[PDB]
A paper describes a structure:
Topoisomerase III (TOP3) is a member of the type IA topoisomerase family, which functions mainly in relaxing the supercoiled DNA and in resolving recombination intermediates during meiosis and DNA repair. TOP3β is an atypical topoisomerase that can recognize both DNA and RNA as the substrates12132223242526. Eukaryotic TOP3α and β are unique in that they interact with their specific auxiliary factors, RMI1 and TDRD3, respectively, and coexist with them in the cell. We determined the crystal structures of human TOP3β TOPO domain, TDRD3 DUF1767 and OB domains (DUF–OB) and their complex at 3.44 Å, 1.62 Å and 3.6 Å resolutions, respectively.
The TOPO domain of TOP3β exhibits a toroidal-shaped structure, which is characteristic of the type IA topoisomerase. The TOPO domain is further divided into four subdomains (domains I–IV). The cavity formed by domains I, III and IV constitutes a Mg2+-bound catalytic pocket, where the catalytic residues are spatially arranged in a manner similar to those of other type IA topoisomerases. Previously reported E. coli TOP3 structures showed a transition from a closed conformation to an open conformation in the type IA enzyme upon binding of the substrate DNA39. Our substrate-free TOP3β structures adopted the closed conformation. Domain II of TOP3β appears more flexible than domains I, III and IV in the present TOP3β structures (one from the complex and two from the apo TOP3β in the asymmetric unit), indicative of its intrinsic flexibility for the induced fit binding to TDRD3. The R472Q mutation of TOP3β, which is located in domain II, has been found in schizophrenia patients. The R472Q mutation may hardly affect the tertiary structure of TOP3β, as the side chain of Arg472 is exposed to the solvent and partly disordered. However, the substrate-binding cavity of TOP3β is similar to that of TOP3α. We could find no TOP3α- or TOP3β-specific structural element that could determine their substrate preferences.
Numbering used by the authors: -2 to 68, 72 to 612
The structure:
């Protein structure tokens, strides 16, 4: 043979590179600092393609490049930003000299193995890395297969070693989809925004025009929040009436009965119902029922659900939750937290994972019992073919993780244990009473077996007194018949969880970009985070959405954005053309831009009134 080949391997972050290399080298790792200070280099000897080679594992630091125009406060025509103005990739963090670092460590290498995180974003970074390293590689084995791509979902021995055993190739289609989204959002975003910042610059005393922006995704996202605001302001409470009766059992208990008609919105018919029941002194039992029912254990955890719970229960904003989750993934405590999958792959050792939790004080006894009783089969969920559900991959304590990391890990773990636990079994009981012509019911739940609600106590069935045993035909003295007059209540501002659900429902913010957009409209102070993590539109945010809507509703409605993202996903699947999707979309929004500029009065008028 000739010279021993050197295999360069690149992960997305320094910690990832170190951990992966430590696993693959079985601890025979030799590490030294790179030129940039951020990135280290991990070297060791091993085997590749049945041959002894030298391994050289390092990393980048997230995206190497960001898309920008070719060449701030300078005088350019926003209309030119659609087609004329050229765009080019620039280093996302120039001080790190990432391209130079890759060239230096990648020089003279024969093979490259890509260990970037496995999403479309990661595939895009693959070609960032390849663009830097390929020109500097050794030319010897230059006509061989020199580029490899590892696929993995967790930084664990099992998943990382298997990745090496079945190396694939980087997906250029998925990489192109990321590029296309970046270029679309940059051009369309800056065009509509820069026009307004200049147009309104110093125009009104109480308006800092630099606060105005448009985004093909962030604006519809804000649109949802402002829509709720509008519903709240225009809400008209309605009076309604509820008939309720109280009954005395044989064991001298007051049963509160629920009206079969539940409620009424007519004053006269309400008075009519009260009159025909208030004098009745006896309630006849017409029917009884006992039904064993199940409160199901949760579906396996996906990203969208994690974000809802982290917000609603843990008080973490979507971006805060994602970075916390990503850090957990980085240290190998959970699987990759960007997934739509709610279905456990068949190969996955669930009992093994459960066994890992058998020693934590909070659920050791619960887990041990489950291992003795035998694990339940998780519910069949959805397999999006991206990653497994977000699952604990390693045991942990609050000492190891710290505040935010532990709180998120505890939920992910408790949620997991529940998926492999049993359903909650309870008794649903009902009694039907006849009072005059009117029907009434009283209901009650009795827990038979807690099931998963032991490890998830917040989903437990509330303790209620068992309904009295009685027979059809039995009669109870009516203790009281009253009619409640009530008022319908307005909705509250959108919670982050509701917004997440809305964005998922309308198909915007796909590929886990939802937390970015939500954080964006918060960072721009278009909404404020109020108690219960509610998103209350600010004055400017309201004005902006109303302004955009008056000019062109399609700028605010998620319809257009949803279709674009579907087109972008088709690029990723190789079912749509990169350049054609770019061209068509940019044409559509260029047309809307010119209409926007012509109809700017729709925005200006609202701006004048609100900001003098
Ligand atoms: Mg990434």
């Amino acid at each position: 043979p000739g010279h021993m080949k050197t295999v360069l391997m690149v992960a997305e972050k320094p910690s990832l590179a170190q951990s992966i290399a430590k696993i693959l080298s079985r601890g025979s790792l030799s590490s030294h600092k790179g030129l940039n200070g951020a990135c280290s280099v991990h070297e060791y000897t091993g085997t590749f393609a049945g041959q002894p080679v030298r391994f050289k594992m390092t990393s980048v630091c997230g995206h190497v490049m960001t898309l920008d125009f070719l060449g701030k406060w300078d005088k350019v025509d926003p209309a030119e930003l659609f087609s004329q103005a050229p765009t080019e990739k620039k280093e996302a963090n120039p001080k790190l000299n990432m391209v130079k670092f890759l060239q230096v460590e990648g020089r003279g290498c024969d093979y490259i193995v890509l260990w970037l995180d496995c999403d479309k974003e990661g595939e895009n970074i693959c070609f960032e890395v390849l663009d830097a390293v390929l020109p500097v590689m050794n030319k010897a084995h230059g006509g061989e297969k020199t580029v490899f791509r590892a696929r993995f979902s967790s930084i664990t021995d099992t998943d990382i070693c298997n990745a090496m055993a079945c190396l694939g190739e980087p997906d250029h289609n998925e990489a192109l989809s990321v590029d296309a989204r970046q270029e679309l959002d940059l051009r369309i975003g800056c065009a509509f925004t820069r026009f307004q910042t200049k147009y309104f610059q110093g125009k009104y005393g109480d308006l800092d025009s630099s606060l105005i922006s448009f985004g093909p995704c962030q604006t519809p996202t804000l649109g949802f929040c402002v829509e709720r605001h509008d519903k709240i302001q225009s809400f008209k409470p309605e009076t309604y009436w509820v008939l309720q009766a109280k009954v005395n059992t044989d064991k001298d208990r007051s049963l509160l009965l629920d009206w079969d008609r539940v409620r009424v919105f007519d004053r006269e018919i309400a008075q009519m119902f009260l009159n025909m029941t208030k004098l009745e002194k006896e309630a006849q039992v017409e029917a009884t029922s006992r039904k064993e029912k199940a409160k199901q254990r949760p579906l396996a955890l996906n990203t969208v659900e994690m974000l809802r719970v982290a917000s609603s229960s843990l008080g973490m904003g979507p971006q805060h939750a994602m970075q916390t989750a990503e850090r957990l993934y980085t240290q190998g405590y959970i699987s990759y937290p960007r997934t739509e999958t709610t279905h456990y792959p068949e190969n996955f050792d669930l009992k093994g994972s459960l066994r890992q939790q058998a020693n934590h004080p909070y659920w050791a006894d619960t887990v041990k019992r489950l291992l003795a009783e035998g694990i339940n089969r998780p519910r069949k969920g959805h397999d999006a073919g991206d990653h497994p559900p977000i699952t604990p991959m390693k045991s942990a304590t609050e000492a190891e993780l710290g505040g935010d990391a532990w709180r998120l890990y505890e939920y992910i773990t408790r949620h997991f244990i529940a998926t492999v636990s049993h359903d909650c079994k309870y008794l649903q009981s009902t009694i039907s009473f006849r009072i005059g012509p009117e029907l009434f019911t009283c209901s009650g739940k009795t827990v038979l077996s807690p099931g998963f609600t032991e490890v998830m106590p917040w989903q437990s069935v509330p303790l209620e007194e068992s309904l009295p045993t009685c027979q059809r035909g039995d009669a109870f003295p009516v203790g009281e018949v009253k009619m409640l007059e009530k008022q319908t209540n307005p909705p509250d501002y959108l919670t982050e969880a509701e917004l997440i659900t809305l964005m998922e429902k309308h198909g915007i913010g796909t590929d886990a970009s939802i937390p970015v957009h939500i954080n964006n409209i918060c960072q721009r102070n278009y909404v404020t985070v109020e108690s219960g993590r509610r998103l209350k539109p600010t004055n400017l945010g309201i004005v902006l959405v109303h302004g955009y809507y008056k000019i062109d509703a399609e700028l605010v409605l998620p319809t257009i954005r949803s279709a674009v993202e579907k087109q972008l996903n088709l690029i990723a699947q190789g079912k749509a053309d990169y350049r054609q999707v770019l061209g068509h979309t940019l044409d559509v929004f260029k047309r809307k831009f010119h209409y926007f500029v012509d109809s700017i009065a729709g925005m200006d008028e609202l701006m004048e009134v609100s900001f003098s």
